[PDB]
Structures are given as structure tokens and as C-alpha cells.
Coordinates of C-alpha atoms and ligand atoms in Angstrom, one line a residue:
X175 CA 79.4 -60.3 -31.1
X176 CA 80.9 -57.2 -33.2
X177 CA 84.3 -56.2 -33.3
X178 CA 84.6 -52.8 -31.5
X179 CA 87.9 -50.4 -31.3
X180 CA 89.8 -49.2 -28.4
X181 CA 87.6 -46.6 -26.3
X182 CA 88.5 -43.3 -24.6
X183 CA 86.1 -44.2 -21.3
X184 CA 82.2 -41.9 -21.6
X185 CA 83.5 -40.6 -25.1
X186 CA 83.3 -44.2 -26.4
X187 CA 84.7 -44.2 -30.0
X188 CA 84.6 -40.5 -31.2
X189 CA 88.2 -39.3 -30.1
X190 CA 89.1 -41.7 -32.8
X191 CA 87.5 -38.9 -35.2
X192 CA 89.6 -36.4 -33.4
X193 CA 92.5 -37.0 -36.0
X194 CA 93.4 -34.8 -39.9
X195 CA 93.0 -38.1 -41.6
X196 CA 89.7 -40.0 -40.0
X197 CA 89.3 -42.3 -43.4
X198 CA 92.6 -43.5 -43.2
X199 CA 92.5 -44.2 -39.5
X200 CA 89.0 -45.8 -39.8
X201 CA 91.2 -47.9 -42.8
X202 CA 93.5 -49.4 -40.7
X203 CA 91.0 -50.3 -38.2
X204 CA 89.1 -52.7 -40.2
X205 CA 92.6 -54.0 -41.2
X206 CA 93.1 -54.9 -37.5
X207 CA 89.4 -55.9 -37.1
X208 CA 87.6 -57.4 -40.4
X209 CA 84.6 -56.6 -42.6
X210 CA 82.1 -54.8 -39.6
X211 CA 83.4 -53.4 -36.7
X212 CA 81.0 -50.7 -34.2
X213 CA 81.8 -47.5 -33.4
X214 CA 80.0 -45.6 -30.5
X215 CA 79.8 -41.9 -29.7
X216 CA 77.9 -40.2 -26.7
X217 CA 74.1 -41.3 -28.1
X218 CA 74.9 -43.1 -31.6
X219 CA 76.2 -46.1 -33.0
X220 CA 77.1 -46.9 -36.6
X221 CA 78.5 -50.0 -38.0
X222 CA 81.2 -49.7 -40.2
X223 CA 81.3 -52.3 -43.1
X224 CA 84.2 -53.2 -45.1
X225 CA 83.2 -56.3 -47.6
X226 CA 81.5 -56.8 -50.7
X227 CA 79.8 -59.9 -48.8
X228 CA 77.9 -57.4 -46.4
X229 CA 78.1 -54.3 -49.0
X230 CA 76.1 -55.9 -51.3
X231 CA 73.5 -56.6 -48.4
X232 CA 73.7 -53.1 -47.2
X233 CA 73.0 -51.8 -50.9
X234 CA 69.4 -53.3 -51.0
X235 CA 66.8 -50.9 -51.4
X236 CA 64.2 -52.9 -50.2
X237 CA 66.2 -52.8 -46.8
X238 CA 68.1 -50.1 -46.5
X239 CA 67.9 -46.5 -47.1
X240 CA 70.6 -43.3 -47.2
X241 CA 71.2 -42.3 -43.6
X242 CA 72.6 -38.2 -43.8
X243 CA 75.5 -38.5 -41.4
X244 CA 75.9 -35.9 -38.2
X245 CA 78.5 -33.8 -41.0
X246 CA 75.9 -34.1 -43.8
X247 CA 73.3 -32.6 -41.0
X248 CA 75.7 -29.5 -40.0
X249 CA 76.3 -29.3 -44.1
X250 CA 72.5 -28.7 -44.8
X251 CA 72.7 -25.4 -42.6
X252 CA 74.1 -24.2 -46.2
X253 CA 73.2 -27.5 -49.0
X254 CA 69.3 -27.3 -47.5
X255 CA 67.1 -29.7 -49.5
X256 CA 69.4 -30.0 -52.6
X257 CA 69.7 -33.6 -53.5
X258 CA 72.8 -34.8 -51.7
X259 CA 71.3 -33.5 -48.0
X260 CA 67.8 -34.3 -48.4
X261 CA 66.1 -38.0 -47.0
X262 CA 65.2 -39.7 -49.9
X263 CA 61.1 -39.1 -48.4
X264 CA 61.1 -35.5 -48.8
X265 CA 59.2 -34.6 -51.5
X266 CA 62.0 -31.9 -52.9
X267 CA 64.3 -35.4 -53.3
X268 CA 62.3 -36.9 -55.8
X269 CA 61.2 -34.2 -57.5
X270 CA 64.4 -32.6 -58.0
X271 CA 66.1 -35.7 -58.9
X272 CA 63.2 -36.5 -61.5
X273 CA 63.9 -32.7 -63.1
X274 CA 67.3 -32.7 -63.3
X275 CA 68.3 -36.5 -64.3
X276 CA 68.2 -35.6 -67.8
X277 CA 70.5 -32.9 -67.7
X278 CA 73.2 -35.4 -66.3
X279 CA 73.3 -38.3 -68.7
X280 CA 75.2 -39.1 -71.2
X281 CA 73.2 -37.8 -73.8
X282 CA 73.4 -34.2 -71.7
X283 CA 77.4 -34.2 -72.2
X284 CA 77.0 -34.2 -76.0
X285 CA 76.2 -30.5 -75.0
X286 CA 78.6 -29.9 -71.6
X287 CA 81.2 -31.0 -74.2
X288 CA 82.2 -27.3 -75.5
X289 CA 82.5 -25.5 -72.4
X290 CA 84.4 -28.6 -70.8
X291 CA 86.9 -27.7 -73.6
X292 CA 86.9 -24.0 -73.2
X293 CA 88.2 -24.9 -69.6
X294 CA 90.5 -28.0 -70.3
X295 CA 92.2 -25.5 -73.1
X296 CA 93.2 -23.0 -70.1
X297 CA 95.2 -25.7 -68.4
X298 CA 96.7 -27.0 -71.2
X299 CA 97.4 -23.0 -71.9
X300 CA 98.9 -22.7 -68.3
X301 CA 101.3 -25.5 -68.3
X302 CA 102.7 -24.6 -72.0
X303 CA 103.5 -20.8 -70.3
X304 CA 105.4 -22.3 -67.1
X305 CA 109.0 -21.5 -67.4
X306 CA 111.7 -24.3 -67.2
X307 CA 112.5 -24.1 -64.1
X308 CA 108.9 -24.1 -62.7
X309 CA 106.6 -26.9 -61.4
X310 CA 103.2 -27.6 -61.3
X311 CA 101.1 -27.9 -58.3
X312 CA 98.7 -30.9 -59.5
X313 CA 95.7 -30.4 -56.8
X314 CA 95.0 -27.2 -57.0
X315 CA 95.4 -26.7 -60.7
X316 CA 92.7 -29.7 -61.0
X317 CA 90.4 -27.7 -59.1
X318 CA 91.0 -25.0 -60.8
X319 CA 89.7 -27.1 -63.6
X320 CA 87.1 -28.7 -62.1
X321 CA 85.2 -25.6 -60.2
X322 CA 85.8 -23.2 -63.4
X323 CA 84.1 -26.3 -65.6
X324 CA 81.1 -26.8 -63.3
X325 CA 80.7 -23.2 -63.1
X326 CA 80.2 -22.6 -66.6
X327 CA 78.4 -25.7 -68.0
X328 CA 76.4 -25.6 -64.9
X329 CA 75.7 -21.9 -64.9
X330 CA 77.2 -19.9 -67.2
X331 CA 79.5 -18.3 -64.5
X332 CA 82.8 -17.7 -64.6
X333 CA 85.2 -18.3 -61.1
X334 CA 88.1 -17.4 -63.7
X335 CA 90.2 -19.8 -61.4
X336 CA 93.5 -19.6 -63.6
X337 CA 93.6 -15.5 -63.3
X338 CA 93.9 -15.7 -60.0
X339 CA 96.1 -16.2 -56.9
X340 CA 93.8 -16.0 -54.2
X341 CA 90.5 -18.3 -54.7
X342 CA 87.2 -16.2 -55.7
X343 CA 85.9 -15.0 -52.3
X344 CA 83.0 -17.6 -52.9
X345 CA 85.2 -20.5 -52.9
X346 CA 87.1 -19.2 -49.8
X347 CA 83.2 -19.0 -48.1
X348 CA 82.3 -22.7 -49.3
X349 CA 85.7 -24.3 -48.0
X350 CA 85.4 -22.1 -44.5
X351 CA 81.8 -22.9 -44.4
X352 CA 82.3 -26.6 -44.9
X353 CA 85.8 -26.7 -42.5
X354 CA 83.1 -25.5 -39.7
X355 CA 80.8 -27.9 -40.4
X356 CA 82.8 -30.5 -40.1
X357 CA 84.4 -28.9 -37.0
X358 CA 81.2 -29.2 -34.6
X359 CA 81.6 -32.6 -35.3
X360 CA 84.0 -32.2 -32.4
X361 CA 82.7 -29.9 -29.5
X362 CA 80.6 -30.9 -26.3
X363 CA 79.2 -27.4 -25.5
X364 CA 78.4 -26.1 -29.3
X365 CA 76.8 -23.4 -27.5
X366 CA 80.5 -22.2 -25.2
X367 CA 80.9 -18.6 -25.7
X368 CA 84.7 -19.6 -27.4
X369 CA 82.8 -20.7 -30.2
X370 CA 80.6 -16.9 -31.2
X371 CA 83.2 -16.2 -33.4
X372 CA 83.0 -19.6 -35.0
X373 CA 79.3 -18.6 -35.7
X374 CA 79.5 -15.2 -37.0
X375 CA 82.0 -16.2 -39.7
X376 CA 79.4 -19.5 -40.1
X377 CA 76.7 -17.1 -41.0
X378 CA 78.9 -14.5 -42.6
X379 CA 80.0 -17.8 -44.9
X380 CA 76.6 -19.0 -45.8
X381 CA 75.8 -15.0 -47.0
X382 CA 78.3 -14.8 -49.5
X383 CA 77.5 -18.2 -51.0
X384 CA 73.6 -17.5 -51.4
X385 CA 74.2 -13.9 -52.1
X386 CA 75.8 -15.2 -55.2
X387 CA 73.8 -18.2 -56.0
X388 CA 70.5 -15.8 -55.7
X389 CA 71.6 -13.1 -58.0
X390 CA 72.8 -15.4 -60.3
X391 CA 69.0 -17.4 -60.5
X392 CA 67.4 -13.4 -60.4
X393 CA 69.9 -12.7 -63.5
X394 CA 68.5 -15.4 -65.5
X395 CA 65.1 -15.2 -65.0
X396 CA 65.3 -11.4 -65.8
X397 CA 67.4 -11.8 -69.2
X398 CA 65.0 -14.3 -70.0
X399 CA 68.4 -15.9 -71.7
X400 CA 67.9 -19.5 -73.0
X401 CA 71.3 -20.8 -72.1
X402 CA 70.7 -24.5 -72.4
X403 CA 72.7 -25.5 -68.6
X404 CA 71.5 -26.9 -65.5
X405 CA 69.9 -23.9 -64.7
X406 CA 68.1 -23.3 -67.6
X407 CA 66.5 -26.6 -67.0
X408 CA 65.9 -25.8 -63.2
X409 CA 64.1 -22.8 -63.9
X410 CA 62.1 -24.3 -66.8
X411 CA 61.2 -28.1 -65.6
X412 CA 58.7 -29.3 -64.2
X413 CA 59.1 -33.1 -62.1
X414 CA 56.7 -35.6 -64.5
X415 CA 55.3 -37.3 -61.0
X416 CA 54.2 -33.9 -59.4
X417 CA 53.8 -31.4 -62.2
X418 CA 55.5 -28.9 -60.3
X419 CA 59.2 -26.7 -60.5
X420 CA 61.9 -26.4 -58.0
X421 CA 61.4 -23.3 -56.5
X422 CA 64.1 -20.8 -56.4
X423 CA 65.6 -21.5 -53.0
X424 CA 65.6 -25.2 -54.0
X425 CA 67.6 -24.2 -57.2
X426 CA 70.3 -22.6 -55.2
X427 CA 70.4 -25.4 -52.7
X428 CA 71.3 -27.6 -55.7
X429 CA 74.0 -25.1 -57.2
X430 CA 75.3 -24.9 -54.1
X431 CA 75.8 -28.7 -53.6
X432 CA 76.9 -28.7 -57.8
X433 CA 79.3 -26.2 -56.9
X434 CA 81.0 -28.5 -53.7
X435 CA 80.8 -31.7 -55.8
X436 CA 82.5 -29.9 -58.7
X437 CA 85.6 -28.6 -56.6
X438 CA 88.0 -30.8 -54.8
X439 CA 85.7 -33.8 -54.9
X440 CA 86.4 -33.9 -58.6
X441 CA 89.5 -32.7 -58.6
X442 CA 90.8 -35.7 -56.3
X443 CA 90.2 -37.8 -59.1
X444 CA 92.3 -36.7 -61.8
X445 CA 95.0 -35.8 -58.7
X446 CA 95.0 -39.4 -57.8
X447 CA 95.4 -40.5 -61.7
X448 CA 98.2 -38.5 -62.1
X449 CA 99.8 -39.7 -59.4
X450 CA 99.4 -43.2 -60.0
X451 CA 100.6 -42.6 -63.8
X452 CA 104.1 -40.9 -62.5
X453 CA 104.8 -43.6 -60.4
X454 CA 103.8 -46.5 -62.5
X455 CA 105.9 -45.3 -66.1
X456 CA 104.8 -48.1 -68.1
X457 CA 100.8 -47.3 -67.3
X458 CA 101.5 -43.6 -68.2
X459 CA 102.9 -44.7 -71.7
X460 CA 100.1 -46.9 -72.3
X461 CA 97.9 -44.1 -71.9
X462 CA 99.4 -41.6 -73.6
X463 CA 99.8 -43.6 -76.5
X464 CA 95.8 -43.9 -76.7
X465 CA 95.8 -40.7 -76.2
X466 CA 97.9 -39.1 -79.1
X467 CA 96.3 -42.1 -81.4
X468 CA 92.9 -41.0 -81.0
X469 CA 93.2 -37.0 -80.0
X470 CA 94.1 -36.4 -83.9
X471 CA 92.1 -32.8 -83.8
X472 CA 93.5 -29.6 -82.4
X473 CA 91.1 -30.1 -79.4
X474 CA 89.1 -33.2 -78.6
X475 CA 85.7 -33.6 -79.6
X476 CA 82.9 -35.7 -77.6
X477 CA 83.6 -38.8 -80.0
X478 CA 86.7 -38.9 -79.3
X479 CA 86.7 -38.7 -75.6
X480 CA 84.4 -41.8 -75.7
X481 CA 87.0 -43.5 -77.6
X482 CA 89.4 -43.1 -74.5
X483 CA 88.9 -46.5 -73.4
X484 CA 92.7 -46.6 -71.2
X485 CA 92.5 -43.6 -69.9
X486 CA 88.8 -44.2 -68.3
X487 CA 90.4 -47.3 -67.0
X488 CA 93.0 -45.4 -65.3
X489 CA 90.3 -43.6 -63.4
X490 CA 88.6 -46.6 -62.5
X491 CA 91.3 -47.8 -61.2
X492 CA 92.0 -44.5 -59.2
X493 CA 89.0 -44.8 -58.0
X494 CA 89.3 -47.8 -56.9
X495 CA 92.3 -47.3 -54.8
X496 CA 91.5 -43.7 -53.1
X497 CA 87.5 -43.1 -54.0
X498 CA 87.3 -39.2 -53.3
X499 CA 84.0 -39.5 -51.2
X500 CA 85.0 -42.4 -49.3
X501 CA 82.2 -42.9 -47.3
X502 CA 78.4 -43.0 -47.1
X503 CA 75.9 -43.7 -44.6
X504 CA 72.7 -46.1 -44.6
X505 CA 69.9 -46.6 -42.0
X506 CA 67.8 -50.1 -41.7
X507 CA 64.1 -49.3 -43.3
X508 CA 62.8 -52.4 -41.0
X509 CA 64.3 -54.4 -38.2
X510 CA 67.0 -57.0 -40.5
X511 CA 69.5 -59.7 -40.2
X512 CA 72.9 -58.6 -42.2
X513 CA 75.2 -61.5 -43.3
X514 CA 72.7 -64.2 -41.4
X515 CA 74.5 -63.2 -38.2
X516 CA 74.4 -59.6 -37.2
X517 CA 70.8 -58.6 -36.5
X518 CA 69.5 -54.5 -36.5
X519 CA 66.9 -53.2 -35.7
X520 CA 64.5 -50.0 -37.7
X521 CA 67.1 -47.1 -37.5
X522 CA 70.2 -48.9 -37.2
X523 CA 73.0 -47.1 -39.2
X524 CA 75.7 -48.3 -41.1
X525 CA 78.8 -47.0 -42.9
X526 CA 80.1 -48.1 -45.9
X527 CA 83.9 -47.3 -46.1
X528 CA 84.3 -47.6 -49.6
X529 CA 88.2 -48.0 -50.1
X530 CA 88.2 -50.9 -47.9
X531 CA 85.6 -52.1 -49.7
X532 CA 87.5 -51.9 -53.2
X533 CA 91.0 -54.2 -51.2
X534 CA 88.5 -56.6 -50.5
X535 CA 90.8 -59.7 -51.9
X536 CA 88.3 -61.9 -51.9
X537 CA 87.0 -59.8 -55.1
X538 CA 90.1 -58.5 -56.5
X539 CA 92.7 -61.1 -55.3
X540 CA 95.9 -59.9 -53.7
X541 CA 97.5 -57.5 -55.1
X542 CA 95.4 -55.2 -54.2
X543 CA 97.9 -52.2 -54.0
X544 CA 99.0 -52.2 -57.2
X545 CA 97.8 -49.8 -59.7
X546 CA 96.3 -52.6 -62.3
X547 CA 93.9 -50.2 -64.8
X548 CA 93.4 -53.6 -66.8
X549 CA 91.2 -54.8 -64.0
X550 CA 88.5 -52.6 -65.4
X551 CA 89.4 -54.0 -69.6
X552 CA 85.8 -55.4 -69.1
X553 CA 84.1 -53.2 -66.6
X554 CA 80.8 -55.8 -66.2
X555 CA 82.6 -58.5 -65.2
X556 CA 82.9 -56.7 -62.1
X557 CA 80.5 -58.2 -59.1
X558 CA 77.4 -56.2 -58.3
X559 CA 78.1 -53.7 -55.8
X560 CA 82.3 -54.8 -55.7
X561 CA 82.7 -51.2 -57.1
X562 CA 81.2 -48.3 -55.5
X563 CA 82.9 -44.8 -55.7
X564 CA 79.6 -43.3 -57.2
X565 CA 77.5 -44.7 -54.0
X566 CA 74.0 -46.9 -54.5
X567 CA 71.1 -47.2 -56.3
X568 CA 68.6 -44.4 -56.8
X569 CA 70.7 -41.9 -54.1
X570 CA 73.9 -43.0 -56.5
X571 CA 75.8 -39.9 -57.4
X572 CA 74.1 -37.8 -60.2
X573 CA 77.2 -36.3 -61.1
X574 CA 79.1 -39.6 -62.3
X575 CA 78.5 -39.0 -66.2
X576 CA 79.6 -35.3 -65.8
X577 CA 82.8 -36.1 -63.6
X578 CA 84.2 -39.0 -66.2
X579 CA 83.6 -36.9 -69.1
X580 CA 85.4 -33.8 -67.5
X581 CA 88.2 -36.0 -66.0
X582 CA 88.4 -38.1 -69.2
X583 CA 88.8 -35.2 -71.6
X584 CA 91.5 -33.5 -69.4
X585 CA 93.7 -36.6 -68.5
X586 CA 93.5 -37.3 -72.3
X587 CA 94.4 -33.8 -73.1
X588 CA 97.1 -33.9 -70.2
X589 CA 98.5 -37.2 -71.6
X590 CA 98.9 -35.7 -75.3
X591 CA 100.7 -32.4 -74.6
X592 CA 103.3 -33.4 -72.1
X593 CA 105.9 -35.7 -70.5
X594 CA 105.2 -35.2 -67.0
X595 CA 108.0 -36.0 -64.6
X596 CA 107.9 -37.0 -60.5
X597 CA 110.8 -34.5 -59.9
X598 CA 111.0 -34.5 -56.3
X599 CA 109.8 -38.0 -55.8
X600 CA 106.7 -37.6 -54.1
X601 CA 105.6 -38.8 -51.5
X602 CA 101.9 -39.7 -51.3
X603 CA 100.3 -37.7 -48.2
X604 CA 96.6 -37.8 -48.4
X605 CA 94.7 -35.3 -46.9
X606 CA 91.0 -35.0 -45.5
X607 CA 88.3 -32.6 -45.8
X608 CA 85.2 -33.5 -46.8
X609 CA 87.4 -35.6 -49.7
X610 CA 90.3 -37.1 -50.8
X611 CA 93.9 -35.2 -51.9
X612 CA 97.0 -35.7 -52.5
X613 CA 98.7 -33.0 -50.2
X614 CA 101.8 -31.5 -52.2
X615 CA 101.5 -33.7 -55.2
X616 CA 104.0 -31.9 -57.8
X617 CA 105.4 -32.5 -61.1
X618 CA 107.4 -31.3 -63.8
X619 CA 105.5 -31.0 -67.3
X620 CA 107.7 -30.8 -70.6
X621 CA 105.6 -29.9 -73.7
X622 CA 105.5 -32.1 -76.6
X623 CA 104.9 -28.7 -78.5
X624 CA 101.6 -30.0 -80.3
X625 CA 99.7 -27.1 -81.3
X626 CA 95.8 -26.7 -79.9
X627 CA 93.0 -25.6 -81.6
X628 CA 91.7 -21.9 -80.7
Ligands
HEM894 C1 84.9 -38.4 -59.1 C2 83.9 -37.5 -58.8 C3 82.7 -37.9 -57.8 C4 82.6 -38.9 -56.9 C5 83.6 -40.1 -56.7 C6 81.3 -38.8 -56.3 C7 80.8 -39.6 -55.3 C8 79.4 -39.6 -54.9 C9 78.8 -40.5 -53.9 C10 79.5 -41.6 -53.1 C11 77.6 -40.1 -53.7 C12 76.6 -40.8 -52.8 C13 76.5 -39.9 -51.5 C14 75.9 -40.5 -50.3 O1 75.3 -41.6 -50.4 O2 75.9 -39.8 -49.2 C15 77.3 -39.0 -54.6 C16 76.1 -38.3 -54.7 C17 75.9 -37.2 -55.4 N1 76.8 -36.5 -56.3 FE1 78.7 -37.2 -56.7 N2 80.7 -37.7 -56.8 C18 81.6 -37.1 -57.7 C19 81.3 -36.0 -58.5 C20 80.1 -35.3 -58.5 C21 79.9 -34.1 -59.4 C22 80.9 -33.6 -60.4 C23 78.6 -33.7 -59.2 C24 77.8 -32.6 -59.9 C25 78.2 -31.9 -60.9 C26 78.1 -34.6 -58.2 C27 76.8 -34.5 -57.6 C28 76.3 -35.4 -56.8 C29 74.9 -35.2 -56.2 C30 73.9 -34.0 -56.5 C31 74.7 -36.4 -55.4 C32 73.4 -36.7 -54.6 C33 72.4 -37.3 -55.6 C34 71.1 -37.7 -55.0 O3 71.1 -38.3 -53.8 O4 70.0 -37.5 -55.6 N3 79.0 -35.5 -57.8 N4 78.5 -38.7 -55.3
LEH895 C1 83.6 -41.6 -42.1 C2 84.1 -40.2 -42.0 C3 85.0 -40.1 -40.8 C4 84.8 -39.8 -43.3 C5 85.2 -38.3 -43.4 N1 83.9 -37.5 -43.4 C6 83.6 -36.6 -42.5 O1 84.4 -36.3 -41.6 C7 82.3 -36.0 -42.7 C8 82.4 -35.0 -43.9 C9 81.3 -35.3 -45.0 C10 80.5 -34.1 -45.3 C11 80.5 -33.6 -46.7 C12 79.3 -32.7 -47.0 C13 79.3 -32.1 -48.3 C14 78.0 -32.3 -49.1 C15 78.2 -32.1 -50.6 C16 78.8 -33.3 -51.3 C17 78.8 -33.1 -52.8 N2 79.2 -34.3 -53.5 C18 80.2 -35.1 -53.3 C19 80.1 -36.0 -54.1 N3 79.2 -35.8 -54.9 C20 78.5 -34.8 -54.4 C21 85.9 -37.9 -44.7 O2 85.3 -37.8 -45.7 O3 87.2 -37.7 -44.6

């Protein structure tokens, strides 16, 4: 049979959830019990899978399809039909994804590539103003980075995240709005009178975030402005299969999701990086010699960021360790047989927990703590589906392009202004929202006093 963890009597599995760092406790787990393991609430069951020898299984499209997790359902109260909460047979998936893949390739960045730098120039700008005796706060400086950038090559919006204190009363609705949702993953009676508070502020949330997202769409198709972002090409696309546009609720439904993507999910990445490069000295100066060899202009220009061949294998290799959306879900299309042994039937789900699936020694050998960026000096000699932190197949993460070309540019910008040092010796605390961070991560930065381009 299948490995199951302890139980908590008619609550089965789901106190285990009842924890600030479910990931990591779901980690250890499949340390104690191997590559599947079940895990049963009150009326579900998911399997949780932890090798590439299942993974790759799990990851065929002909047999299996996304699943949108009990979290992913309470998310689409505010994400609707944008691309990450819709079932991949609703019609507003494939058409959306058909409209808007363009406007995420590579290609696309050639023209992301400016605004990126107008944003990645204000940190830079920030850390060369700190005082000597000051420090850095790494995560929330990265998101102030990477909301600010997807605000403005997405929409042409400005959160203005480094003027400010206090985070734009938007962001403070998306992260409240998200923290519920995420909450009723935990309450028996949803409908208790202890929780109309709870609901009011839910609703109140969800208000200020389409308020924004509306008048921002009504703006643009007033002005008539031909910006040349992601919502230009919303409001002017049609989907080659159907013929038709995204209407304008669907267009905030995917600026919404954009928007969460874009903010800590992101920002994990380069948090991670940077932590891994302070505590691993002789990585750091490997990258930060690629980086002041090929940054030769006053700021960087696309070219150049696709000559940063180290520093992309640092975020692999971040990635690889502490993937900042950890987990998706799958459902069987048709009754199956996974790994010759463990039979399912139509509807079965399964998890994929994606950082046990990249310490899987049997693909990466055993030394699979260290942080090794030359594992990724040929990035296709990787198996098929030994590397996931983007997800699978055709629901794969749209946004990967975007997020490597936002957190390549920075890290290489980082790496060429300053010395960065691990003053008070941190110690790695993850925490767990909907993503990944490094809770208190601080450094000191010392400027190299290169000049930047204005
Ligand atoms: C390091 C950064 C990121 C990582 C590791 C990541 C990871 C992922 C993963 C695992 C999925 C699959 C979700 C699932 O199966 O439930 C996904 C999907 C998605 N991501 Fe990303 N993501 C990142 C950044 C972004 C960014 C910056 C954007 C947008 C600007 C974005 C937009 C999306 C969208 C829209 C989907 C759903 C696509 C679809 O199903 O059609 N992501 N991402
Ligand atoms: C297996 C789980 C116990 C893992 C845990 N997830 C949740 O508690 C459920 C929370 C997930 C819901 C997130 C919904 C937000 C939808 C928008 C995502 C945008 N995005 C991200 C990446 N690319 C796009 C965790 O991640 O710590």
C-alpha cells in the first residue's frame, strides 16, 4: 500500500496543515516516508509525490491534467478566470493563454527591457544612498523591485514602492485578501458568526483591488494610448482559435493574478540567490566577475543580460533548492496505473512537491544541499521533468521568461555595484504564504562607486 502520516483521529491528515511552514513540514515527511505518501482530510485525498521517477509520470498530458487546489479555489473569489485559476477546459483558459503568449516570450522582453531598467536603476539608487551604518532588508526591497517592474511593463502603473514606507493600499488588500484565503483552509463552520469580520474585510479587499484594476482598463481604453504592454495587447487581441477578445473583467482577472505572481513570488527568487551567494563567497565572486566583465555600459542593455550565463545559473540553482511556488496540484484525466504499482482512478489528485523533487539523489547525486550553480553549465543535460520550478507543460508558468530576465538583470546589476556582506550571520528562516522567503534576510552593501547611466 501507500505510505500515510500520523493522523489526528476524524480530522485525518489536515492538522498537519495547521502549522506557518506547511511546505517544509510536508518536506520532511517524504524524508521519513519516500517518493508518494497520502494525505487525507474530512472528504479529500491527494497523493503527494516526491520523485522524478513518478514526476515525470504525473507530468503526462495525455494522463494527467492541473487540479486547482482547495487554496487556488478560495483565491479565484478574487483571481476569477485569469489563467492561473481557471481548469484548463474553460474556454477563457485557452483563449487567454493563446492571446497573451506572445507578449511573454523572449522576443516580448526585447521591449520589457527598458522599463525593467527604469526599476532595477531605483534599487541600485537606494542602496548607493544608505548611510554606513545602515543595512538592507533583502526581501522586501526585492519586492519592491519586482511589483514596481510588473506594474509598469505590465501596465504602465506606478506602485512607486521605493517612496514609500507603508505598501500602496493595493498591495496591503492583495496580501490581506490572499492571507484569508488561505485561512479558510482551516475552519470547520466557515459560516460561525466569529468569522463576519473575516468576511467584510474579504469583500472590502477584493473592492480595492478591482476598483483599481477597472479604472486602470477604463483609462486606457478612453486615452485610446498605444502603450505597447500586456494591456495594450489584452485590450487589442483577439485568440487565433476563437476570433474573439478577453473581455474586460477577464483582463482584470489576469492583472490581478500578474500582479500576485509579480510580488513576493518573484521576489523569493532573487532573495534566495542572494542568500546563497553570501554564504557561499567563492560562488558570489564568480558571479560578480561575469558580471563587471560583461556590464561594460552605464546600465545593462538586453544583450548583455543574455550574456549573463553564471548569474542565470545561480538562479537555477536557487531554484532548485527553494522553488518559490513549491507546489502544484494534478487530477487523473482517466482511471491510471502510476509507477506500475499505485493504481487511481478518474479524479484522483496528486501533489507534486517540487523541492523534494529537485534532492531527488538519484538525479542530482548526493550532495544535494550544496549550492552547486555548475550543475546547470549545460542546462539540457538535465532529465525531462528532473527540474520543475516553472510547473508542466501547456499550464507551465507563462511568466518564466519575464521572471529570469527581471531577476537576471538585477542580480547582474546587484553583483556589479557592490560587495555585499552577511553582517549578522543569518540565519536562514523560511517563511510561507502563498510562497517562499527568507524571513529577516539582511545584509550590508558597500559600493564599488561605479557610476550608472541616467
Ligand atoms: C521565479 C518566479 C516564478 C516561479 C518560480 C513561478 C512558478 C509557477 C508555477 C509552478 C506555475 C504552475 C502553477 C500550477 O500548476 O498551479 C506557474 C504558473 C503561472 N505563472 Fe508563474 N512563477 C513565477 C513568476 C511568475 C511571473 C513573474 C508571472 C507574471 C508576470 C507569472 C505568471 C504565471 C501565470 C499567469 C501562470 C498560469 C499560466 C497558465 O496556467 O496558463 N509567474 N508559475
Ligand atoms: C502544499 C501546500 C501546503 C503548499 C502551501 N500552499 C498553500 O497553503 C496554498 C496556497 C497556494 C495559493 C496561491 C494562490 C495565488 C494564485 C496566484 C499565483 C500567481 N503565480 C505564482 C506563480 N506564478 C503565478 C505553500 O505554498 O506554502
Amino acid at each position: 500500500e501507500m505510505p500515510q502520516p500520523k493522523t489526528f483521529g476524524e480530522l485525518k491528515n489536515l492538522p498537519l496543515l495547521n502549522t506557518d511552514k506547511p511546505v517544509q513540514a510536508l518536506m520532511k515527511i517524504a524524508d521519513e516516508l519516500g517518493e508518494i505518501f497520502k494525505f487525507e482530510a474530512p472528504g479529500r485525498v491527494t497523493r503527494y509525490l516526491s520523485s522524478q521517477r513518478l514526476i515525470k509520470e504525473a507530468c503526462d498530458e495525455s494522463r494527467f491534467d492541473k487540479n486547482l487546489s482547495q487554496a487556488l479555489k478560495f483565491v479565484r473569489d478574487f483571481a476569477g478566470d485569469g489563467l492561473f485559476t481557471s481548469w484548463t477546459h474553460e474556454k477563457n483558459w485557452k483563449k487567454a493563454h493563446n492571446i497573451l503568449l506572445p507578449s511573454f516570450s523572449q522576443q516580448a522582453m526585447k521591449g520589457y527591457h527598458a522599463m525593467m531598467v527604469d526599476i532595477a536603476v531605483q534599487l541600485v539608487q537606494k542602496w548607493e544612498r544608505l548611510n554606513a551604518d545602515e543595512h538592507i532588508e533583502v526581501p522586501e526591497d526585492m519586492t519592491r523591485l519586482t511589483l514596481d517592474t510588473i506594474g509598469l511593463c505590465g501596465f504602465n502603473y506606478r506602485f512607486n514602492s521605493f517612496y514609500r514606507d507603508q505598501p500602496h493600499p493595493f498591495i496591503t488588500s492583495m496580501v490581506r485578501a490572499l492571507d484569508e484565503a488561505m485561512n479558510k483552509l482551516q475552519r470547520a463552520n466557515p459560516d460561525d458568526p466569529a468569522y463576519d469580520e473575516n468576511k467584510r474585510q474579504f469583500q472590502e479587499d477584493i473592492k480595492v483591488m478591482n476598483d483599481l484594476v477597472d479604472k486602470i482598463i477604463a483609462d486606457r481604453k478612453a486615452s485610446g494610448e498605444q502603450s505597447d504592454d500586456l494591456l495594450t495587447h489584452m485590450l487589442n487581441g483577439k485568440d487565433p482559435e476563437t476570433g474573439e477578445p478577453l473581455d474586460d473583467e477577464n483582463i482584470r482577472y489576469q492583472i490581478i493574478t500578474f500582479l500576485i505572481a509579480g510580488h513576493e513570488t518573484t521576489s523569493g527568487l532573487l532573495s534566495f540567490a542572494l542568500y546563497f551567494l553570501v554564504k557561499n563567497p567563492h560562488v558570489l565572486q564568480k558571479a560578480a566577475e561575469e558580471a563587471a566583465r560583461v556590464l561594460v555600459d552605464p546600465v545593462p542593455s538586453y544583450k548583455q543580460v543574455k550574456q549573463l550565463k553564471y548569474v542565470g545559473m545561480v538562479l537555477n540553482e536557487a531554484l532548485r533548492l527553494w522553488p518559490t511556488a513549491p507546489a502544484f496540484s494534478l487530477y487523473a484525466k482517466e482511471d491510471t496505473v502510476l509507477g506500475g504499482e499505485y493504481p487511481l482512478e478518474k479524479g484522483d489528485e496528486l501533489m507534486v512537491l517540487i523541492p523534494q523533487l529537485h534532492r531527488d539523489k538519484t538525479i542530482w547525486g548526493d550532495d544535494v544541499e550544496e549550492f552547486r550553480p555548475e550543475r546547470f553549465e549545460n542546462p539540457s543535460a538535465i532529465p525531462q521533468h528532473a527540474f520543475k520550478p516553472f510547473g508542466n507543460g501547456q499550464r507551465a508558468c507563462i511568466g518564466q521568461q519575464f521572471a529570469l530576465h527581471e531577476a537576471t538583470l538585477v542580480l547582474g546589476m546587484m553583483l556589479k555595484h557592490f560587495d555585499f556582506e552577511d553582517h549578522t550571520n543569518y540565519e536562514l528562516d523560511i517563511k510561507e504564504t502563498l510562497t517562499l522567503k527568507p524571513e529577516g534576510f539582511v545584509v550590508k552593501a558597500k559600493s564599488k562607486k561605479i557610476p550608472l547611466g541616467g
